[PDB]
Amino acid sequence: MERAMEQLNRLTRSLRRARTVELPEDNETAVYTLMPMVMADQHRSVSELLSNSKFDVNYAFGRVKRSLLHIAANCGSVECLVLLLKKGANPNYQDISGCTPLHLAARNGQKKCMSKLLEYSADVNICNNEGLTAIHWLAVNGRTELLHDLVQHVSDVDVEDAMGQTALHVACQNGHKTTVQCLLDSGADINRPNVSGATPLYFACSHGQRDTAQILLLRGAKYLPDKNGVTPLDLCVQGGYGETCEVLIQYHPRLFQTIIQMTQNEDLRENMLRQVLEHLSQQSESQYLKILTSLAEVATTNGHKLLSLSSNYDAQMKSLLRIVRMFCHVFRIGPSKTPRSQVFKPLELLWHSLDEWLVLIATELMKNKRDVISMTANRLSAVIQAFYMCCSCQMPPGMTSPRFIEFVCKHDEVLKCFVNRNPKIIFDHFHFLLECPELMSRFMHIIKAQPFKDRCEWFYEHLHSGQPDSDMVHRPVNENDILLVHRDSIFRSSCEVVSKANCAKLKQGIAVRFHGEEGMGQGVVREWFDILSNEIVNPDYALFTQSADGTTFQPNSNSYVNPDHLNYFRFAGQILGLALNHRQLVNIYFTRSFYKHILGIPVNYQDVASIDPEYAKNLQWILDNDISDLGLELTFSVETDVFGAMEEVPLKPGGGSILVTQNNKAEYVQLVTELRMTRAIQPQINAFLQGFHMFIPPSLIQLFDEYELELLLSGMPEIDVSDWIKNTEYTSGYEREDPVIQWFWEVVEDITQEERVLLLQFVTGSSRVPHGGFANIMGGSGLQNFTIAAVPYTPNLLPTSSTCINMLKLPEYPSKEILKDRLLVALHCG
Amino acid sequence: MERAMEQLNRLTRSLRRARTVELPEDNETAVYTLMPMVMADQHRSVSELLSNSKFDVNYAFGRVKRSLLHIAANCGSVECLVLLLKKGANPNYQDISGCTPLHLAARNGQKKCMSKLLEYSADVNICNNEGLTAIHWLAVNGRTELLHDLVQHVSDVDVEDAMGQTALHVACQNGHKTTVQCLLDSGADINRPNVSGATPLYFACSHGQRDTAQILLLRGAKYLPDKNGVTPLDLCVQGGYGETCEVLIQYHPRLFQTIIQMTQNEDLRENMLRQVLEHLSQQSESQYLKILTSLAEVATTNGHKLLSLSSNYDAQMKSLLRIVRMFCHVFRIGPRSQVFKPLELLWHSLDEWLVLIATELMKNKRDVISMTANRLSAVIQAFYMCCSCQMPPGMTSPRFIEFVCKHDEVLKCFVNRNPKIIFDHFHFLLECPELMSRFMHIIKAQPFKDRCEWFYEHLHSGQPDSDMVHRPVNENDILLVHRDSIFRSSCEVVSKANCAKLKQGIAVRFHGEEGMGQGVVREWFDILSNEIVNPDYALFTQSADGTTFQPNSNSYVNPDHLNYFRFAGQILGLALNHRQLVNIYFTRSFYKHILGIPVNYQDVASIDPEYAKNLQWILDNDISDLGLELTFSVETDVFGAMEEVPLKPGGGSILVTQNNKAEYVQLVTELRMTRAIQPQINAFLQGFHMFIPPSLIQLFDEYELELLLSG
């Protein structure tokens, strides 16, 4: 009967069990209606479809040109592909890249899908566009069980892809233990080379698969390099895998003597070759001592090479610097007692070579003294440099080695020759000198033999050296870098933010923002320094007080009233250090005493005269004439009143009744002045210097003078000598027509700008510059310009000045040249 | 040499005592050399030096031309004060700023310094250039003991400075209760007026010191405004001090009424007024209902005039919405319901004949009408919060539903005139399912271009600190994603992020590059859309046409599918939030699911036309046309397993309803289209509607949302 009944029951079974009626024969529409029942492996639906269909099962569709079987492999379905294959499906179909349905099933790791798919006469040698066959895809995810049955149906396990890598190479790259074992026992070559002639271990060490390599070596792997001749261990240290090196070194003990001799190479990173031999050193104490031992003769034989002055040195000293820096570091990290002395026996032969090397050179040079000298000095200086680091590693840091100090002293004169030749060597080769104040003082006079502004850029270079990315430009200003302060309590607010901040980031960059202000810039920080300069001179905080000079300041003795005075002192030191770090000037001038305290050199009688000239005048008399014949009451002790309380201060414990004579009056004067200057401010200056030292190391700043340090803080103000002369009064013995002042005014004119400020510091100590000219100079809060007094001339008599009244006493001289040298040595004696 | 023996003795004793005795005749040298002893209070040393000196103790020095007596007073020394004053120092000397040593002693709060200065006949009325005496500094420092000692020697306790302040006012400014107690005990004026009319109560309300106000009211203070008529209560309410208000409530029983009847002012903030009201609400339950009663007549008398008269539109309804929103807030902050019932009747009765008025509009229906509707809409809108105050939230009471449904025609007429009246006055329809849908089709008649612009305006509305004009790129807002694993990295960073951070701004960065800009965001959303459409992640599948995609059915095809489905909703919500098009393209049934309306058979035809073709054919026929076979139970196959579902719950159908196929076809389509993808739809929508609430997003149909997202 007509198809009305036939379509009625087909739609009846459609509404009853989601059954089909008919399938269109057009390829693109037929396939694009048959995903959903294959999504869940609906075997009942697809079985009914095969009953009534004329659609080929080998169709290409989509951007990848997959077949129906590829959906089954991807989805993990099993029943649909069984009936799809029964329809006549080809399991050797390929996608755009040649993807066999075996590969897609392998991509998802479907054990069941590949089992029946292979059972239907599927070729196993089909490869993708990149040459990856079936087993290559299984090696990416490393399913060993699916490898086991597949390789049983695969003729050759050494099939190479387009890149030339077998299944073993990629399996070793992924570091799967069971997969590489299964491939090797299936008949694969353990030492199969690639297109680049690389053993499978070449890729193993590149990725640092320690356990995979260990089986390969234990199974009979052969140590061979690549076609370029580079050993796998060379890439293994260049891969940074210490554990893989440990396996190689124990399997091949000859590599131990081989790894230590490539340390001379420079291409490999120093910090990355650090990790490889630290790991072997810490494996055991026996390995710890031999690695320290092995590097000892390596340094010994490398040092012998440096004794050949005719050979190249730039690469040699870098290798010597590399080894010795690493040599002491391994000793510092410690083993995994007496073995420290045991390893010193490999070290003692190193010293015996080193001490012998220089003494024959040093004796040769001193005989010559009694430019090839320049290069020879540089070479041994690195030896002298290497002479220190392994000296400093003998004991924990904190002191200089006495054995180092003894031997340096006995050749100090020879060492004094090298610093005489080139002052630039004291920083990089004599960096240890900064750690030894005792030797620093002896070489201080040599360093001061060149009072140049070159030292200014030296100090900035030394401070910025060793800091990563040490550039003061193009630094992003992050939110965390910005410090918020409030102008109502700017002095206290600035203390809080810097206390909670990080020193390293503040040294690298500066970012301070005032509350309620959005306009940011470097000028704001400059104004922040300026207002801070005006805050420290404000007596409200009671931290600094005006001197008798009237323009300089000294620490306040009664600063203990403020509870946070110590916190303010360290805060002041921190901000001044940051200003010096970032090359920011300060418009505040301080007394000579403050600069002497922070520099560390002791003060003298002239310092007392800067604040109390009357008392120093009495002290000047006592130090000139004899005191034993006078029979005064000098008993090395004084009775004083401090803070309204009576106190007796004996200058010597138990020596408070010993009469002071001419011989011992030098220390009597020094002690009483030191006690009066420093006792009332000793904790205050100690808190200030440590606050300044948290950002400026004491060793680096020690190379300056009191006048040099003030000049850096005060910048380089201009001096108009012609204007200064024309508006300066002249009285007190010397007339305006007296040639002596003309000589003095000519001397200040013809000297260098560096000498001009030095003369100004010597006569007054202040770098003041009035607005609009040099008229209207304030002396002791009163109107007073610079004046010169007249005194009789005696041999070895130098002029002296008092800044309180801007007066200087100048001995009578008959010529300008006599006046100049007397003034020049006076500047040198400042 | 000159006086050898005399100078030798001087030399030895000077060094033995560690300091010099003789002092040079230079004034500048003399003052600086004397500093190290004056701050040290070395009375014996300065006495010895002064006996051997011929200087003047009244010499002026320093920036302010201060004296030696000034330095000692600044450091707090006492004994050195006596020696200087006994040697001829003038205690009444003042600096260039008018500062006498009395002020410095007052500044340092030294009892010994001021007592000895008074003993040496020092004037107590000395003032600086600003006309401020030492009493001002003592009051600032809060030295009650020093004030009592000084006031015993001060004739005029009520002295006024340049500003007109007195010790009573300045102490109140500092908030010292002990100082004002001594001043009040001294007999000073309690209602002293300032040049602007300020009183001690004027500063009491400005600072809101509860203890000081209580003491001031205890002593018998008077209530009066200033010269400008500013009531002291105005400063107290503008200072937000509920503690002082409650104290003044006890003293003045009329204060609570006055502040409540002054609530209609517009100069004071919204949350600022709520703070004082709740402070005086939680003091006691009797006061809690008392103020609730008091605000009840204010609300009903404010709506009574809005019922009757017409005035400035913005001024009137804003005042009503101002008071009613705070009236319900204080109730929500906290037998309470029973006492609220009569308070309900004050505005419910007022609303009752508003219902009578709205009934007259239907009689009128069966432009001054528009303006009456605006006033009526606001009070009807305000009546919702009144009904919301009757019960806990989360539900819509049938009371206003009954009133609105019976009076919907005039509401429909004005909504047609002004569709935007729904957004503000009918903002309450977002929680009433019965009323959103009935007004849903009415607002659908508006053009799409007008509707979308309104939606964007209210998408960004109601968000505090919502700035869309060059928001700074914060460190936290920066999201780092790797190019190779952009899908995984973006999901991870979004999981650890917050909705509020990405709601306003957005920042995307990649490793090895510093790419930033709107294009980076556009390509980030584009690459995510391209990675989700194709089945590479096995999360979406192609449709019949091949250019459209639908979600994968089986759950856990991808292990992290639930995370991605939530993640997909998150990113698409952000794309809509920032108002840019996306290249995503889903099926029509996909938009039906995200909207809410049931999926028709046409969407089913988009996957398998033959299955829907049979369903639509039988829908147009009878039960058994041409001998058709029908069943009341259906069967579906999942994962090769055979399962049966008897259509309607409780068993198969037993009676013929709507050709016995209408609802049956609807049931089989819905069950087949959503039961297999129900859990994944919920995960997607949850991530999508958390950025845009469903009420504010369901106002568009499928076609309107498609155009705005795709373009």
Author numbering:
A (entry chain A): 1 to 336, 350 to 383, 443 to 902
B (entry chain B): 1 to 334, 352 to 383, 443 to 787
Lines from the paper:
Here, we report a cryogenic electron microscopy (cryo-EM) structure of the full-length human HECT HACE1, along with solution-based conformational analyses by small-angle X-ray scattering and hydrogen–deuterium exchange mass spectrometry. Structure-based functional analyses in vitro and in cells reveal that the activity of HACE1 is stringently regulated by dimerization-induced autoinhibition. By contrast, HECTs form a thioester-linked intermediate with Ub before transferring it to a substrate. A RHO-family GTPase, RAC1 cycles between inactive, GDP-bound and active, GTP-bound forms, allowing for spatiotemporal regulation of its interactions and functions.
We determined a cryo-EM structure of the HACE1 dimer at 4.7 Å resolution, using AlphaFold2 (AF2)-based predictions as a starting point for model building. Each subunit of the dimer consists of a C-terminal HECT domain, flanked by an α-helical ‘middle domain’ (MID), seven ankyrin repeats (ANKs) and an N-terminal α-helix (‘N-helix’; residues 1–21). The MID and ANKs form a concave platform, above which the HECT domain leans peripherally. The subunits are arranged in a closed, head-to-tail fashion, giving rise to a ring made up of two sets of ANKs, MIDs and small wings of the HECT N-lobes (for HECT domain architecture). The large wings of the N-lobes are juxtaposed on the inside of the ring, giving rise to a yin–yang-like overall arrangement. In the cryo-EM structure, dimerization is largely mediated by contacts of the N-helix of one subunit with the small wing of the HECT N-lobe of the other, with minor contributions from the N-terminal ANK. The structure of HACE1 FL provides a rationale for how dimerization inhibits the two-step catalytic cycle: at the subunit interface, the N-helix engages intermolecularly with a region of the HECT N-lobe that coincides with the conserved E2 binding site. The binding mode is incompatible with the HACE1 dimer, highlighting another layer of autoinhibition.
